[PDB]
Design a protein around this ligand. Structure first.
Ligand SMILES: *[C@](O)(C(N)=O)[C@H](C[C@@H]1CCNC1=O)NC(=O)[C@@H]1[C@@H]2[C@H](CN1C(=O)CCc1ccccc1)C2(C)C
Ligand SMILES: *[C@](O)(C(N)=O)[C@H](C[C@@H]1CCNC1=O)NC(=O)[C@@H]1[C@@H]2[C@H](CN1C(=O)CCc1ccccc1)C2(C)C
Ligand SMILES: [Ca+2]
Ligand SMILES: [Ca+2]
Lengths: 306, 306
């Protein structure tokens, strides 16, 4: 028993990280078969930042202008192209550590692991959620751009995020591996407010089920609620609406614990209205929203990766 | 910026995990050069558990009784011995993925990453602390025994923990890689109370410095304190004494932030005496004690591993 904020094992992704330098800037790339993927602002300078002309900057770069290093072994670039906000650098050597992989675009409220990297070398791995406002609350310093976020299923790495920016509010923004931003953000220094963030209600419910599975049951009350009545309370506390799809996704945790989804919703309503009165749930004094239903089932069942 | 509970990249350790079966039980082993290390209770049955005679159980086992699988490739066992609470299985094949490594015995309040494994395959990675009572608050299910905890420094994996038990209180206990338990625990089902746990005061101070580095400064008050006066308050709230060694270890974070260690101690004294009044620090509504001073400096400086 026990419940931790668990990241995916990072080794399959570690074997794909490289360094990309184009004149000035060094950032991280992802090396899969004979392609290196990285943020297109590797081609920018200091003065370029309010509104870079990425097409003009790229027309002025040669294959040989890209210095790609895989553990300080140079990979020769033999082609380059821009796809939305990433570059794709074709190299003359396929990565022999390429895992089975997919590119996926995740939905707000889904979770993934980030392998934070600097100069092509890993610093650390942590789990987070894609906020409802399409930001992430990560740990990213200068040099981390091109770090990726991912999920694993059996032997297959699903890459979902590449890091590009830290907004003036100190939250993080990036793209999918086709280079399309999550959220209404652009890769330039210009005004670009994130939308108001909300709490991921289906994830809080999942975590309350995790608490019950792990014997932390004090918050269970004796009531039930309707879905519509729960949603009127959710709204007031800046929680996302709970949908029938969400109720259905919580069904297996409901069966494991014997606690109907709408009964758990009545317990969450009381926590929102009354607070926790100085108590903790799974070691937290706040309601946790960075575990999906699937994350709870995986961790509580010991699901492994090949 | 941002501050997360960051684990070490797990790939170097992933390449060392195997499965060990001796009749009944399957658990995890650690394969380094031509030796597999695992918990000695792989040799036990159901009836053996109140007080196993590990020497008698082992005299009755053959090399060939140990089925070692590295990704479901069998490794032939050509020798075995018991060292404290682990076995060492000599195999006829050295692990070609062996990293540079050391075995270390960590001190209470130090941190490490756990790679939670089942059937020799990784489930996930998370960071924790060795509690002052020599337990860990992990996430371990049946089948996780033999999972390890580790730190990385440049290219060198320091293995510090191997998982053996979950006490009746739901906390976790294990050994160093020489098989000596942390804490007054034994590998049998018998009464064995953990000592009262305390809060790791030097780690809370480190995390408050992390908060300042990341711009979360609301809790800084205008006062100072003596070390002795701080320790009288620490004592009351079941915090560990802060030593001069700890003050010296916090000196670099003190210099980075401009906040003297004893000034930070005065801010922590006010938080203990008055609470947080519904506020958070780095996203937490409690005072966090699972980051060491070195963990804070590493994360805030982007330290990487080769
Ligand atoms: C990334 O380029 C790198 N090399 O690591 C960097 C990461 C970023 C630094 C601080 N923490 C981080 O996550 N990203 C950037 O510096 C990006 C690039 C220009 C500016 N930028 C920002 O993060 C600032 C964004 C901003 C938005 C609105 C107003 C002002 C600034 C790019 C090309 C967006
Ligand atoms: C480990 O053997 C495994 N195969 O995974 C297992 C891990 C443990 C199961 C539940 N979560 C866990 O972390 N460890 C054990 O089952 C150990 C082995 C016998 C009993 N045991 C316990 O964890 C129970 C400890 C206990 C202490 C006091 C009183 C009653 C029980 C061994 C050999 C200690
Ligand atoms: Ca050349
Ligand atoms: Ca045989």
């Amino acid at each position: 028993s026990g419940f931790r904020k668990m990241a995916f094992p990072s080794g399959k992704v570690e074997g794909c990280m490289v360094q990309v330098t184009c004149g000035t800037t060094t950032l991280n790339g992802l090396w899969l078969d004979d392609v290196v993927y990285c943020p297109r602002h590797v081609i920018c300078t200091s003065e370029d930042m309010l509104n870079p002309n990425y097409e003009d900057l790229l027309i002025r770069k040669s294959n040989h202008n890209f210095l790609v290093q895989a553990g300080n072994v140079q990979l020769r670039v033999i082609g380059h192209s821009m796809q939305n906000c990433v570059l794709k650098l074709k190299v003359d050597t396929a990565n022999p550590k390429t895992p089975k992989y997919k590119f996926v675009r995740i939905q707000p409220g889904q979770t993934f692991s980030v392998l934070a990297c600097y100069n092509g070398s890993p610093s650390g791995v942590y789990q987070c959620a894609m906020r409802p406002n399409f930001t992430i609350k990560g740990s990213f310093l200068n040099g981390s751009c091109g770090s990726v976020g991912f999920n694993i299923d059996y032997d297959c790495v699903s890459f979902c995020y590449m890091h590009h920016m830290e907004l003036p509010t100190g939250v993080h923004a990036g793209t999918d591996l086709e280079g399309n931003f999550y959220g209404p953000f652009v890769d330039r220094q210009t005004a670009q407010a994130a939308g108001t963030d909300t709490t991921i209600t289906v994830n809080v419910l999942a975590w309350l089920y995790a608490a019950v599975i792990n014997g932390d049951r004090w918050f269970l009350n004796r009531f039930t609620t309707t879905l519509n009545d729960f949603n009127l309370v959710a709204m007031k506390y800046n929680y996302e609406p709970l949908t029938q799809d969400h109720v259905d996704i919580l069904g297996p945790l409901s069966a494991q614990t014997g606690i109907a989804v709408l009964d758990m919703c009545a317990s969450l309503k009381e926590l929102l209205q009354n607070g926790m009165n100085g108590r903790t749930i799974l070691g937290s004094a706040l309601l946790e929203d960075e575990f999906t239903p699937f994350d709870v089932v995986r961790q509580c069942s010991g699901v492994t990766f090949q």
